[model samples]
Target: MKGQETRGFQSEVKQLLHLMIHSLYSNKEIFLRELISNASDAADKLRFRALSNPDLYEGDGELRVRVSFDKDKRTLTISDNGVGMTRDEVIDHLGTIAKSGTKSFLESSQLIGQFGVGFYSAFIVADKVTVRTRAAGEKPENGVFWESAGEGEYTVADITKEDRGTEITLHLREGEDEFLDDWRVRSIISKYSDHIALPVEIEKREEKDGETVISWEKINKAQALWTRNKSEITDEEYKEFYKHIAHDFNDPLTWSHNRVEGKQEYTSLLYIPSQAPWDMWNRDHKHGLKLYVQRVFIMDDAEQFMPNYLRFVRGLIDSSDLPLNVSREILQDSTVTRNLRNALTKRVLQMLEKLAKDDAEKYQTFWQQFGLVLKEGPAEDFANQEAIAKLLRFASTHTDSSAQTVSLEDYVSRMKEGQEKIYYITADSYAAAKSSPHLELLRKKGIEVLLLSDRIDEWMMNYLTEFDGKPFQSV
Candidate 1:
């Protein structure tokens, strides 16, 4: 359409809009968070589409969102260099109920949040809102402009935009002057949108040389390393990230980055540190992975998401299935939490298994650092008893070394001819176990015996009675 067209919003949309502005008045600050989140999603859509059609970038490839306010105009704008909208999209996406473009673009519509209604949150603080946008790859002359006063009527018209993106300006109503302050707005962004994986720039104006100077300041980190593709991340970056989260000085021995989809969707990045902390044995020592829901930091040391045996593991889990307001109390009874815990537990065990098979020297380092903690696995996790047993190591008569490098499978393979049982002896120390009186006969007969000395050994051996069809017999 060449001229402006005025129309009333869809009836259902009108009702929803009314509810959002009136019912959600208490949390009016969420309006900025919602709009910024939408801008981030728009940039995500553009990036995904640009993968196949690079021209959609239109030569301006650096994507970001900008927040600016004018005290004289009594207006604030949230702008983004992302997938804008067409004339029809402006009408449908902004005027209809649940007609968000992102609804079908993302894997699950639920992940889009209340996109259809999130836009309406602006009305809670403003009497009128206006949108000017030009979708990527479209002609500048085809830019569309939309405006509404929250009285059930909206208007759309043709316009020209020099750039490809969306700019939403809100005409702040009375009593909304708080948003005009830079500090107030910055604090709100810090509280809610700091984890948004895009640069949220805030306009900075300063008086210099008797004139006003303008600049843009980024207010967010703009990237959560765990959210990026694993292949794109370097080993150094992983190590640096581990140091940051675990607060450790040494690099991690190994790490796992996985994105599990289908039944439940989540991204987990778990790391095995090269050395254990001093208070690792202290029951009160804080130990667990950071937790995030949809890239928003939820809590630190979320113990519910990892079993006790894996308490040494450090990293984070960003789950798309959990609610934004999820709490530790809620996690105590959530099946989703339980499911994620089991999956993460399995992931850690698998990482250990691979490390043991692929790198003997590194596995030995891990065993020396956290072997006693892992010995608690068999007693705590019944279903994974066999799998955890395979990861256990011990010193044996075969090597006569103090280092616990012998695996159960190695002992079984080196069994004496016609020997149907695995033999073992435990003592308070390695020397005592190696020189035990009970081992005299086994040594004479050339039967290998597992020498266990760690305090966890006796308790661990009680549950590990058999391996590979061979029962265990104490010597």
Candidate 2:
């Protein structure tokens, strides 16, 4: 207890953790997946940093996640040899809800669902959780011991840890003994984490001639799903991989996986999340796919690879041609990255096209979530303006229900005879747009006019002058 301290969690954390624990009881196994994802992220961070500072690896560079369970102790531990956190980091990250590296602790208006609650998810299955970590570059004596019982406060103390990583131990609740079984955990790993790019090892113990023999066995496929052939991967694996990269709770509406050969060699997996993130409209919020070079993670939310209009897309690109040492500045000027960006953008559009054709129901869901963001494509991306146009939807008089399901093609097909232009109205609200007096003439003529009321509708209309050689006429 020489350098120990106790601190209370952020007020919001107490409420949310309790809610998640109760609401998420049906999906208890997700606790392992969440913890494993956190470990993988920690490992990825160390690997990325060590590229510039090799000493952080501390002579043990084989990045891995090891999981072990103690039947007698009723605890399951997930350990990683990655960029561990210092004592202060332990308090800030584990104590506060959104202080995790990739998130911001914004004001109350933007608070709900903005935090990275991955670590706290452990409490779903555990009554108590302990974290032991030593920052990669810190002294062994500076390692932190953090323990919490899902209460208002948690305790953090300095400890001596020879390893440079974090180990999270979950003391399973009484009826949660299923997690203690190796077979159950192995299946969960196979189900949720098989596509993880790093090995996820589970400790194996066998009694040999009255003596207990123990070894570590990798439980997951431990391979990048994008590198594998499409035929070999399943829909569930793709969905799980989407969850891993997006940190999302729901499956994606659609995804595209491609391996480009010849001029630019790269493998890209892109996903359209079913729901928009809380910060979707925050222009400064992080966007774009995870970037990798030759199977090594280079960066997360690399915006250089995508236009702002497609910011909601989540996934990653693993490039074989780009230099591993490439930086954000280099990515901006490099012709190779530009080529890949254009190709990747087309790939996403094509994916949307296929989704729109193959599954109307799913496309409707996607449009509801991201239609406004996609509206910005015509203004921001000139080359793909037409392609993005095909994916746009609007609420028109044909539906008259305020649901945006009508596409430009549908509107053109249903246009009245001798109609020379596409008629639309922009307003501050859907009801106002629908009840506009200007629509009286069009309604009498049995002509349909598109109702545009989203905040972006007016701005997007400025660039969306014509579709299919028909000029837009605002009513």
Candidate 3:
């Protein structure tokens, strides 16, 4: 066994790890998705490489992800026969959090390892984690072991391995034994990764006469639903896909299925979730947008793929026009991406418009949760200001009750013939917007003035100017 030893983690890494472990516990279920995503990425990388050099796989590329549990040992392991990390790669990749590579990775939108906080999730349910990996290479094979206790210190050592892959063993915390159960682990995998293109398997044991037989059991629907024809996909299938993609329990409020055909060919399935995620307010939180090339998963949560105002939207884009082996830099600036962005943005806006016209009540509920985000679009997306303006809703003086929010369209519909300017007021609250002296004259004339109370409303309105040739005047 070729062996090497390493020391403890840097103080900053320890501090960040501790803060993340505790602060993110409220949404710990995300860990399962994160790990499954990592596994899928490894497989994707290997497949991309195998395209040019089949020998790289050595005929062992079945292309699947597996999760297993050991109750007695209080350990849960996520394993993949895909691309594995080298010795230095393990330390550089696993030892650190918020890797700089992730920024370029995100910008290029060609790879998945964004945020770099997924590895730390193990700390939420485990006292320690050990990563055993063997990279693919012809030289003398080496195995790297990285173990970190929740506290500051950790160790990395080199060992011998017969195969080229990675396996992560999580030692559960005292009261986290539930992770060691087959059913619990399966449930988590199914929730977050059921839509993953690769198979996710759980190991189970059965008694055969006087002996125990162990086998790998499929736990999730291994099919990639996004690749199928949109018309063939049922509403239930769409909802199930949304549940896995958005990590939300409720059905999506609306969705857009697009298959673009032209110089750049691509398909996209985007969904507007019914409610904001718990971390929606955290600008640092990762958005839910997976990117793929030619049916192969590339990156997850490409923040730039959609404007920040539409951060609540969750879905993925798979394009055949992009190169399978394209570098991250090219993907970000590629002309195809811009076109796809424009098409996707329009589709989403159109879906929202339909929802507003067809189901006003449900649209009102959506506005209540995410109305503030839409307010930012007019300024940021000047090209679509007129359209986005139509989507904007606000509580106003003309509303019969405080709970009844009105859109710019609604305000215009009820506008007195002489009301030439569209009026709105921004303040800390609905009461503040209503009490302001600015609306006194407008109220006296029975004219409606939109009330913008959400904190995001003020900042977003700075970018907006006019709607439907009617100038938006702020008080």
Candidate 4:
């Protein structure tokens, strides 16, 4: 029954594609991103399903994406060793616009929607598109060939394919020769997908002895270490990845690697460097974590999730939740972005809280390094104001220790009866705060005063207003 079939494009898809092609024309290169993203997802799914079915892999465990072009034919091809779909899947997926309810699926599961409308982006530059795919473990007859000319109608038929995965060939429209250049492809890859966990390879060529030889060369890093199992990754590997990302030779003092799933899915591999970089205090200096959408590297300084106070924090947030077509400008008010901001703020604070409690020495060292930077948290993050307040360390009169080791919880526990306020003093330096006239009355009354003297003390005080229920008095 499946010798060949023709299907019409849905109205939903026609409208979106029309808009994407005729209006949203700037990022035509996104077609490559979307296709590769889809390919990566397929590979990941194949690996995941193989965990239980084992045979779905069909003996090939290594998954990679490859791009090659034919100049003579004016065709660009992208291929992946992944879980290819059956004839029906190809039809249901590519033919029916993956269904009219496609967006509902996208909004429902952030973990699975990085392949949205990006597929249509191909139409902007391609006059005709052909897809050849063979599903893993399926009968040979099940492999499919799907083709379209962006004129609403598509053809699908059974095909013979030896491998398990997909290959997409784009017949470039007239005058669209720019995508044929390898250097242009390389630049686009470096800008967008350099950090894709899977090896995204492009075809390379060389002339030897008057003979043309061709081979595939990896253009992406292919190894996003954070995507691996935490138990399997050694600390040294983490440090090395940090060095690569942070450009710092010193190892991170500590780090956290976690995957968050649910409404907003993301993975975070955050690092606390052993020391501050030269521009730690430079407000104008670009700061923020790397951002990736569906394992495809998006931006290096995606500061959206990192607040100004946490600017010193390093590492990246890889989100599967953000729309592949979402622009940076739209991300400013993205509900998903805001939700992730809240989630990550809690995550960072929790990591610090853990160190502040069980690893006091390390936390103290962290304070010495980044406490002033962190002091700006209260003003910037109302949601996490209390948590940040709890993490602040201070030298106080109660302890003769010069170390900033007194937590607000400890100070609260030792508060004298009728001592309604938390007392602290700020000065230009620790020595000045210690010798300030305000401490005289507190000392006479046997009340401990937290001594604060970082250059950012004034800036921090603007936000570090009240701890627990106690208003701070500058005594």
Q: Which candidate number has the best lDDT?
A: 2
Q: 158-241 in candidate 2: lDDT tens per residue?
A: 999988899889999899999888789888877777878778998988989999998988777777788899999989889988
Q: Tens-digit lDDT track for model 4 on 1-475?
A: 2688787887767655654565435657757766776776677667656655888877787889989887889999999989899877887778764323333222221122122345767888899999989999998667899999888788988888888899999999888898899888778765545445678888988888899999888887776777877997777667756755665545677888998888778999888767766455555666778777777565567778877778778898888878655556767989899887778878888888877777688788888888877887787788888888898888888777667878888888888886687777778666656776867777778788888767676677777778877887775
For model 3 the local lDDT of residue 91 reads: 75
Query: What tens-digit string does per-residue lDDT give for candidate 1 at 268-384?
Result: 999998887755676777888888787666677889988988899998899998987678789899999999899889999999999998988999999999988899888888878
Off by over 4 Å in 2: 99-117
Question: What are the runs in model 1 whose C-alpha is more than 4 Å off?
Answer: 1-221
TM-score to native of every candidate shown: 0.56, 0.91, 0.73, 0.52
Candidate 3 lDDT over 168-246, as tens digits, reads 8888889887777777777888876666777888888889999999899778777788877777777877886776566
Q: Candidates ranked by lDDT, best first?
A: 2, 1, 4, 3
lDDT, residue 410, candidate 2: 78
**Least accurate stretch of 10 residues (summed lDDT) in model 2?**
102-111
Candidate 2, residue 129: lDDT = 95
lDDT of each: 0.82, 0.84, 0.74, 0.76
The local lDDT score (0 to 100) that residue 342 gets in candidate 3 is: 74
Please give the ranking of all candidate structures by TM-score, highest first, separated by commas.
2, 3, 1, 4
